[PDB]
């Protein structure tokens, strides 16, 4: 990172379930110990049903996401709706080819008719890994065990929502850079659904 730059101390989760995918995050931005934003929207839309969350340098990730959205509009004008794999590949190429100057990590969650919802993770460095579920950020380190004990394939929508809520509540509880509300996006064949949960809800889990 650059001296004086803004870092992303987040808690990011993406879980695949029977009908699609759910992408969730907290809403805290910090400048060390001071909270510069109590309510930030960390769920970035790259296409209609292709969303992502970012970590590392904030400026670099914003520039990369803008370029990727431009790329996906160009692709859509020619061939139509892109697959989650294509967006992941573009993200990976941008992150890997510039890894000597930009610090960036991405979690990509997508839905399409062919593949029925997918999760990809691109850690620092630019490698890509396709996973049934992914976690990232400073708080993720505190929930590696819990998630490993509580994930099942082909869960229902409510079960996946509860799993993400519990995991992110623990991540918020233990990490000092993770904050107030939990935001989630559900991507299925029906459409895009936005959900938010407040501290008085999840802190009593």
């Amino acid at each position: 990172l650059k001296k004086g730059e803004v870092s992303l101390g987040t808690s990011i989760m993406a879980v695949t379930f029977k009908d699609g995918v759910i992408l969730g995050a907290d809403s805290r931005t910090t400048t060390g110990a001071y909270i510069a934003n109590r309510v930030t929207d960390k769920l970035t839309r790259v296409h209609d049903k292709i969303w992502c969350c970012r970590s590392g340098s904030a400026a670099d990730t914003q520039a990369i996401a803008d370029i990727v959205q431009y790329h996906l509009e160009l692709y859509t004008s020619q061939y139509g709706t892109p697959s989650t794999e294509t967006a992941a590949s573009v993200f990976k190429e941008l992150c890997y080819e510039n890894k000597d100057n930009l610090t960036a990590g991405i979690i990509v969650a997508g839905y399409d008719d062919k593949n029925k919802g997918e999760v990809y993770t691109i850690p620092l460095g630019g490698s890509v890994h396709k996973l049934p579920y992914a976690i990232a950020g400073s708080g993720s380190t505190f929930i590696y065990g819990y998630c490993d004990k509580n994930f099942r394939e082909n869960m229902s929508k409510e079960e996946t929502v509860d799993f993400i809520k519990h995991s992110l509540s623990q991540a918020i509880k233990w990490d000092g850079s993770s904050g107030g509300v939990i935001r989630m996006v559900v991507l299925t064949a029906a459409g895009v659904e936005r959900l938010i949960f407040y501290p008085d809800e999840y802190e009593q889990l």
Binding site: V6, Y34, N37, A58, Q62, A63
Partner: protein, 215 residues
């Protein structure tokens, strides 16, 4: 072409051989039908008060205003360059400028220079899509907020804003809240003082610039 790098080696050499190279409270608050930006009016060259009545509210466009901290010359130059670009784009499109367009221009320009242009900004405005408030960092990151503070007195102002902010605020309530935050910065921070400048941008109306709103 562009900003020059001549005499960089010479300046470094002078610095190595003992040659000294010679060398604020801002808030933004959204209300139900617009946005207010407010600032203190004290300008200091170190511990010495250079000017007790300094205008820190700058106009990107008639209904898009901003204030800055950090390197003053960089802030002024970037604001003026983006204002020129915004005016040219508005003439080209025959449309009222959008705040998001200014946000994109500022973000890309600051990211191009990799944080070497020390401009930290609060940008508020109203356009045909509604009212908008943004914070912009030197390295090229931007954020959206309902109420924002900036400068050395930003913590006191943020405390005041956290004490008395609601979803539905009238114009008068928002003006009073912003003025109170600036007053807290004035009283409790050594860098802030003197008077308060306010600018109110309401949807469907001309921008109202009140200099020395509270002296």
């Amino acid at each position: 072409a562009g900003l020059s790098f001549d005499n960089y080696q010479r300046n470094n050499f002078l610095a190595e051989n003992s040659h000294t190279q010679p060398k604020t409270t801002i808030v933004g608050v959204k209300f139900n039908n617009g946005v207010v930006i407010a600032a203190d009016t004290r300008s200091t060259q170190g511990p010495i008060v250079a000017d007790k009545n300094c205008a820190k509210l700058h106009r990107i466009s008639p209904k898009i205003w901003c204030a800055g901290a950090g390197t003053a010359a960089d802030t002024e130059a970037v604001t003026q360059l983006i204002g020129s670009n915004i005016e040219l784009h508005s003439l080209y499109t025959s449309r009222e400028p959008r705040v998001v367009s200014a946000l994109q221009m500022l973000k890309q320009h600051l990211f191009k220079y990799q944080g070497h242009i020390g401009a930290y900004l609060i940008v508020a405005g109203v356009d045909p899509t509604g009212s908008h408030l943004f914070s912009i960092h030197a390295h090229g990151s931007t954020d959206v907020g309902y109420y924002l503070s900036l400068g050395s007195g930003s913590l006191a102002a943020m405390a005041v804003l956290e004490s008395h902010w609601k979803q539905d605020l009238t114009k008068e309530e928002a003006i009073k809240l912003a003025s109170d935050a600036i007053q807290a910065g004035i009283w409790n921070d050594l860098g802030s003082g003197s008077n308060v400048d306010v600018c109110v941008m309401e949807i469907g109306k001309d921008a109202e610039y009140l200099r020395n709103y509270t002296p």
